[PDB]
Design a binder for this molecule. Structure first.
Ligand SMILES: *Cc1c(COP(=O)(O)O)cnc(C)c1O
Ligand SMILES: *Cc1c(COP(=O)(O)O)cnc(C)c1O
Ligand SMILES: [Cl-]
Ligand SMILES: [Cl-]
Ligand SMILES: [Cl-]
Ligand SMILES: [Cl-]
Ligand SMILES: [Mg+2]
Ligand SMILES: [Mg+2]
Ligand SMILES: [Mg+2]
Ligand SMILES: [Mg+2]
Lengths: 360, 356
C-alpha cells in the first residue's frame, strides 16, 4: 500500500524482525504448542526468555555484576514514586535536575514523600538546554541526585553524565536507554519504560545497584519495595510475560546490528539528516533545543507561526507520517527517531520538509 | 503433538483471539503498524482501549455508575492500592479469609491501617466458604474484602453476601467473567487479566465511581485513573488489545451465561470423575464450595500423586501440579480451557486408576 512513516513518540516503531519473529511463533512458542502468552512464568520456556532478556541487556550495556536488572510493571511513572518511597528517608533530600516536563513529574512525586531540592534547572529558558554540571547545587543529606537523560517533550539530551560521589545518581532514561554506550557504574539506578526505545509498553526496565536497594524498607508496601523484586528476580507476582518476550526480541535485534556502539552510529546519522534540514532551512524550521543539547531521539521544532505548523502537520499526515505533532503541552512538531525508526523514514521527512518549505 | 493447557496463571487463551492477533500483528486496522507500535494517544489505540471497556460493560452488564479501569501491577498491587485509597484513619479493612490469596490481601492492609477478620475457614485448611451469617462486621468498616475464587484451594463463592454497612470488595482474579455477576453487590471488583480475560500485564478494576485523597502518590490514586480513563500514563496497550480480542470471543459464543454453561460442563467432567473414582482421587473442597475454575485433588498417597502428574506431563498435560504450598493436583479450567481438554483429563484419570 501507500507509505507509512512511524515517528510515534511512545509506544513507537519496533524493529520489523522482532515483530516478524513474534508473529511466526505466536501460537506455538519453543515447540510447546502454546503461545508465550499462555505459559506459566515458572515454566522453563518462560524463564529462558526472562533470563535471556536480562543477559542481553547486561551484555549490551556492559552492566556490572553488582547490578541487577528488574522488569517491573507500572511504567516510568510508577518509578517516580517508587524511588523516593525506597530511598527518600527522613532527614534526607530528593535532589532533582530539571531539564523538562518529565523531570518535573518525577520531582512532584518525591515532594509527596519527603524533602526535595532543585540542583539546577533550565526551566526559566523553557528547557532548551542541559545545565552545566558546575551549576549543580548539591546537599550533604541528598538521598540521591535525579536526572532525566533525554527530555522527551523538549528534545534535549545529556551528552555525558556527572560524576557524583556524595549520593547515588538516578536517571530516567525512558527515551534514550540503549541508544548509545553507557557507563552504568556512574549510576545507583537507571529506569526506563520500555515503550520508547526497547519494545512494548507494559514493562519498565530498572537497572539497580543491588546493595543500594536490596534491603527491606519498613512501612513500604511489598509490591513497592525494590527489595521484593530483587529477591524474587522480578517474579514476585505475575510478570508481563509477552512484554518481556518482545523486549527480548528487540534486544536480540540490537545485538544483531552490532550493539550500542553501532546503534549510536545509526542514530547520529538519522538525527543529522533531520537537523541539517532544519539548519539549512534559513529559519523556516526552528529547533527548540540549543545545538549543544540537541537530542538524538526526539527532534523538536516549530515553523514560523501556528498556521504554518498546522498546515505542515496536516500535509505530513496526508503523506503517511505518523506521530509528528508535538506533545500537547508544548505544540509545534516532534520527530521521534528512536533506535528502530528506519533511516529512509528520516530521508522521507527531510523530503517532506524541503518541499513544504519550497512550496510555502 | 497433543498439548492440554491447564496452566493456573498465565493461562490458555481462545484460539480465535490468538489467531486474530497473529494475523494483524504487523498491520493493525490497515495502519501498517502493529497495535504495539501505536501511540496510546492515537485514535487508533483509543478505539481499542474503549472497545475493551465497552465489551466488559456489556458482558458483565456493568451499571453506568461504575467505571472500568485498566491498571498495571497485577492483582497484587491492588492488595495495597485498595487500603491506600479507602482505609482511612478510624476505619477498618475487614477481610473474609477463604484461602492464601485472601491472606496476602489482608497482609498488605495491615501495613496501612486497622484490619479485622470477619470470618475464616483457615482452621479447616480452607475447605469451604464460611456462612455469611457468621460474618463479624464493624460500623467503621472501610470495606469488606473477599476472594471470590480461592485459586490455590479450589473453593468458590456460590453467591455473594448482601452488605450495606460498607462496600463489598472482591479479588475475582480467577473467576471474573466466568459466569453472570450482579455488579451492584460490590463497591469494587479487581482481577489480573491472565486467567479468564487476556494475557498478563493488565489488571481490570471495576469500581463504583462515587466510592473512590491527600498524600497518596499520583499513580496509586484510583481518582487519577478514573479521571484520565486509564490513560494517565502509558497503558499496557498490547495486553488491552488482547483483552478486547478475548472479550470479542466471549461475546461471540453467547456471553456470560453461555460461558457459564461451558464452564459448568468442564467442571462436571472432572468432579464426576473424582466422585466416581471410589476414593482413588479425593477433592480438597467440600462439595458445596467446589470451584468451577480450579479443581483441586490428590491421589491416596504422595507417590501415586507423583506418578499421576508425571504420567500427565508425558501425555501432554501442562500445569496440573498443585500449588507448592499445598501440593496435590490442580486442574485450572478458566474460560478458554476447552471441554475437550477436560475430557482428555478424565480419560487419563480413568486409565491411570485402572492401571495402578
Ligand atoms: C514516556 C516517559 C515517561 C512516562 O512513562 P510511562 O511508562 O508512560 O509512565 C517518563 N519519563 C520519560 C522521560 C518519558 O519519556
Ligand atoms: C493470580 C491471583 C492473584 C495474583 O495476581 P498477580 O497478577 O500475579 O498479582 C491474586 N489473587 C488471586 C485470587 C489470584 O488467583
Ligand atoms: Cl521532557
Ligand atoms: Cl513524551
Ligand atoms: Cl487461594
Ligand atoms: Cl495461584
Ligand atoms: Mg542474534
Ligand atoms: Mg525502507
Ligand atoms: Mg463479534
Ligand atoms: Mg452423575
Amino acid at each position: 500500500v501507500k507509505q507509512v512513516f512511524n515517528f510515534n513518540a511512545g509506544p513507537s516503531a519496533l524493529p520489523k524482525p522482532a515483530l516478524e519473529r513474534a508473529q511466526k511463533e505466536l501460537l506455538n512458542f519453543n515447540d510447546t504448542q502454546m503461545s508465550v502468552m499462555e505459559l506459566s512464568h515458572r515454566s522453563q520456556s518462560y524463564e529462558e526468555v526472562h533470563e535471556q532478556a536480562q543477559n542481553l541487556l547486561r551484555e549490551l550495556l556492559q552492566i556490572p555484576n553488582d547490578y541487577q536488572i528488574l522488569f517491573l510493571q507500572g511504567g516510568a511513572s510508577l518509578q517516580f514514586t517508587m524511588l523516593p518511597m525506597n530511598l527518600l528517608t527522613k532527614g534526607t533530600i530528593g535532589n532533582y535536575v530539571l531539564t523538562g516536563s518529565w523531570s518535573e513529574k518525577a520531582l512532584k512525586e518525591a515532594k509527596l514523600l519527603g524533602e526535595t531540592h532543585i540542583a539546577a534547572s533550565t526551566k526559566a529558558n523553557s528547557y532548551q538546554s542541559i545545565p552545566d554540571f558546575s551549576e549543580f547545587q548539591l546537599n550533604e543529606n541528598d538521598a540521591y541526585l535525579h536526572i532525566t537523560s533525554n527530555n522527551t517533550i523538549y528534545g534535549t539530551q545529556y551528552q555525558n553524565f556527572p560524576e557524583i560521589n556524595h549520593a547515588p545518581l538516578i536517571a530516567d532514561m525512558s527515551s534514550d536507554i540503549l541508544s548509545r554506550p553507557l557507563k552504568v557504574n556512574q549510576f545507583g539506578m537507571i529506569y526506563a519504560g520500555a515503550q520508547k526505545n526497547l519494545g512494548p509498553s507494559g514493562v519498565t526496565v530498572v537497572i539497580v545497584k543491588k546493595d543500594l536497594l536490596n534491603t527491606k524498607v519498613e512501612q513500604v508496601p511489598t509490591m513497592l519495595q525494590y527489595a521484593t523484586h530483587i529477591k524474587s528476580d522480578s517474579l514476585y507476582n505475575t510478570p508481563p510475560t509477552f512484554s518481556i518476550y518482545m523486549l527480548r526480541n528487540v534486544l536480540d535485534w540490537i545485538k544483531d546490528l552490532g550493539g550500542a556502539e553501532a546503534i549510536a552510529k545509526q542514530n547520529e546519522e538519522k538525527a543529522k539528516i533531520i537537523y541539517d534540514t532544519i539548519d539549512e532551512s534559513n529559519g523556516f524550521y526552528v529547533g527548540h533545543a540549543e545545538k549543544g543539547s540537541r537530542s538524538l531521539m526526539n527532534v523538536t521544532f516549530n515553523l514560523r507561526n501556528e498556521e504554518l505548523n498546522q498546515q505542515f502537520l496536516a500535509k505530513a499526515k496526508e503523506q503517511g507520517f505518523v506521530g509528528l505533532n508535538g506533545h500537547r503541552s508544548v505544540g509545534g512538531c516532534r520527530a521521534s527517531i528512536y533506535n528502530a525508526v528506519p533511516i529512509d523514514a528520516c530521508i522521507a521527512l527531510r523530503e517532506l520538509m524541503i518541499q513544504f518549505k519550497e512550496n510555502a
